[PDB]
Amino acid sequence: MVSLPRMVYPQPKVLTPCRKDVLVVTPWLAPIVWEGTFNIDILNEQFRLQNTTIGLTVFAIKKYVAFLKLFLETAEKHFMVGHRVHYYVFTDQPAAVPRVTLGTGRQLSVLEVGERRFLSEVDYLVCVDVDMEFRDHVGVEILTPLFGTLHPSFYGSSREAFTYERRPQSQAYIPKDEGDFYYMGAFFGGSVQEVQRLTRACHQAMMVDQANGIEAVWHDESHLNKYLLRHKPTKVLSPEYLWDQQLLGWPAVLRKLRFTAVP
Numbered sequence: 540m541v542s543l544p545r546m547v548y549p550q551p552k553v554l555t556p557c558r559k560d561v562l563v564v565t566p567w568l569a570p571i572v573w574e575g576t577f578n579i580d581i582l583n584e585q586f587r588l589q590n591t592t593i594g595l596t597v598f599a600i601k602k603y604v605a606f607l608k609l610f611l612e613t614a615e616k617h618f619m620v621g622h623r624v625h626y627y628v629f630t631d632q633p634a635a636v637p638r639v640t641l642g643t644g645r646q647l648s649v650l651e652v653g654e655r656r657f658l659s660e661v662d663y664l665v666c667v668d669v670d671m672e673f674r675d676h677v678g679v680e681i682l683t684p685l686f687g688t689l690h691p692s693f694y695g696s697s698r699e700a701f702t703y704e705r706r707p708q709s710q711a712y713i714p715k716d717e718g719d720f721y722y723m724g725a726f727f728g729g730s731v732q733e734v735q736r737l738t739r740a741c742h743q744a745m746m747v748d749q750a751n752g753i754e755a756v757w758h759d760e761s762h763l764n765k766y767l768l769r770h771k772p773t774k775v776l777s778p779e780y781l782w783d784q785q786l787l788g789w790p791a792v793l794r795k796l797r798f799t800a801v802p
């Protein structure tokens with residue numbers, strides 16, 4: 540709404556693309572987020588002027604509570620620093636959640652397991668796996684109504700090789716001649732409204748499948764892929780945002796490894 544203040548930064552050059560080695564915009568005109576495609580100062584200004592609050596949700600059930608300390612401490616160094624952040628930790632062991640020191644404007648809620656809340660508390664929801672650590676900047680460049688992340692093992696694969704659910708009997712079914720990308724279930728998000736629409740659709744689809752005695756090959760991730768095929772994401776995150784260095788190394792196409800699998 541409000542005007543940006545005067546800012547001094549390099550002029551963007553029309554006849555000079557930032558990245559020539561990768562696709563930076565999808566066929567439906569959604570940016571694909573890679574290092575070099577965004578000026579974080581301009582984006583931070585835009586989002587701070589709106590007093591943006593980001594919710595970060597993670598599940599830590601059974602032995603996975605062990606991953607919380609590193610996850611949260613690294614999120615404090617790299618995730619949305621400067622912005623309001625609300626962590627939501629869903630766990631079966633509330634007393635096992637580590638006591639992590641948080642920066643100002645950041646809070647954590649422990650929710651025991653064994654909603655309209657989000658609508659009134661945050662503007663965007665980011666949903667990720669907990670067996671991970673942040674190694675570099677993950678900020679407002681990802682925020683948009685609905686986003687998915689390119690799975691690190693398939694970003695260079697032909698659609699026929701994607702491990703989508705291939706049985707027509709499943710709600711997650713995607714035939715061999717369809718598909719844009721293979722999105723990983725470990726990192727998705729968007730506005731609260733869009734994330735709840737997505738989770739509701741996948742939940743209903745999974746219930747239909749269960750009633751028909753079938754379980755999608757990659758569970759929730761198969762359904763996330765069917766949803767994002769039919770409801771195109773407004774931004775797509777590159778594999779910089781979901782990487783496994785032990786498994787895949789550090790390819791030239793990745794200028795930064797931002798959020799990675801814990802060995």
Ligand SMILES: CCCCCCO[C@@H]1O[C@H](CO)[C@H](O)[C@H](O)[C@H]1O[C@@H]1O[C@@H](C)[C@@H](O)[C@@H](O)[C@@H]1O
Binds near residue numbers: 690691702724760786
């Ligand atoms: C040594 C195991 C190799 C797995 C590589 C492909 O990753 C898996 O892809 C499937 C879909 O085909 C699922 O998305 C699954 O969750 C992925 O495995 C997980 O992510 C990879 C990157 C790696 O960190 C594995 O250890 C994870 O289990």
Ligand SMILES: O=c1ccn([C@@H]2O[C@H](COP(=O)(O)OP(=O)(O)O)[C@@H](O)[C@H]2O)c(=O)[nH]1
Binds near residue numbers: 600669670725
């Ligand atoms: O005992 C378990 C198994 C899974 N998870 C949660 O479900 C996510 C998906 O599981 P996992 O990381 O094992 O899957 P992978 O990335 O290996 O495919 C984990 O990050 C956790 O957030 C959990 O909390 N406890």
Ligand SMILES: [Hg+2]
Binds near residue numbers: 596664665666734
């Ligand atoms: Hg979520």
Ligand SMILES: [Hg+2]
Binds near residue numbers: 598667668724
């Ligand atoms: Hg998640």
Ligand SMILES: [Hg+2]
Binds near residue numbers: 741745759
């Ligand atoms: Hg689901």
Ligand SMILES: [Hg+2]
Binds near residue numbers: 737738742759763766
């Ligand atoms: Hg989903």
Ligand SMILES: [Mn+2]
Binds near residue numbers: 668670
């Ligand atoms: Mn995981």
